[PDB]
Design a protein around this ligand. Structure first.
Ligand code: HEM
Length: 184
């Protein structure tokens, strides 16, 4: 179940966030913690591709080796708040699971600057969801969370001390695939 109406950043700068580049998840918190593993790797690219707002996602469970990519088309609900479809793809954008009614996620950018961000997502796959999931992002896959994004976590009435870090998993990412998937 999802329980939060995440508030988007006041003055969110969409062009900077959706610039075609990659964001790495450094830390995450699911309010239903058993919905996601305790060890995980994830990243995304976000950009406009031929006028369309897109995300490309990467998930990797470093223990099981379970790997999947997704291409998402985003619709705007309000500034910084989106509803996204998704199709599961290989790293080259070939479709494994097509866009499907009922497979979507909400995506809210609660805070962002040029290097760091705090997002909320509620994933739905038909009648199931994956709980309220918060993620701390950085442009640099190895960056420790600075005071700015930790402050945003506090401003959301959360505590960064409770987030689970992705940093001790040897995560390695295919940035080229994520960039190219924006077009697919
Ligand atoms: C737009 C940051 C993220 C977004 C938007 C997101 C979105 C998604 C989407 C769209 C799927 C379904 C993929 C498919 O079946 O084709 C998915 C699955 C999954 N995500 Fe995330 N995710 C994000 C971050 C994470 C993180 C950080 C964790 C735990 C850094 C996580 C754990 C999972 C798990 C375990 C699944 C599998 C669910 C299942 O088997 O039903 N995700 N995610």
């Amino acid at each position: 179940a999802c329980t939060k109406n995440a508030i988007a950043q006041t003055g969110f700068n969409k062009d900077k966030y959706f610039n075609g580049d990659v964001w790495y998840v450094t830390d995450y918190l699911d309010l239903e913690p058993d919905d996601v593993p305790k060890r995980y790797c994830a990243a995304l690219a976000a950009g406009t591709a031929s006028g369309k707002l897109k995300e490309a996602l990467y998930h990797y469970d470093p223990k099981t080796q379970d790997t999947f990519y997704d291409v998402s088309e985003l619709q705007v609900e309000s500034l910084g708040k989106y509803t996204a479809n998704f199709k599961k793809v290989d790293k080259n954008g070939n479709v494994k699971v097509a866009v499907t009614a009922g497979n979507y996620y909400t995506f809210t950018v609660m805070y962002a600057d040029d290097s760091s961000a705090l997002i909320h997502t509620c994933l739905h796959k038909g009648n199931k969801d994956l709980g309220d999931l918060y993620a701390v992002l950085n442009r640099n896959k190895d960056a420790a969370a600075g005071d700015k994004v930790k402050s945003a976590v506090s401003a959301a009435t959360l505590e960064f001390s409770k987030f689970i870090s992705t940093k001790e998993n040897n995560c390695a990412y295919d940035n080229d695939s994520l960039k190219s998937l924006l077009t697919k």
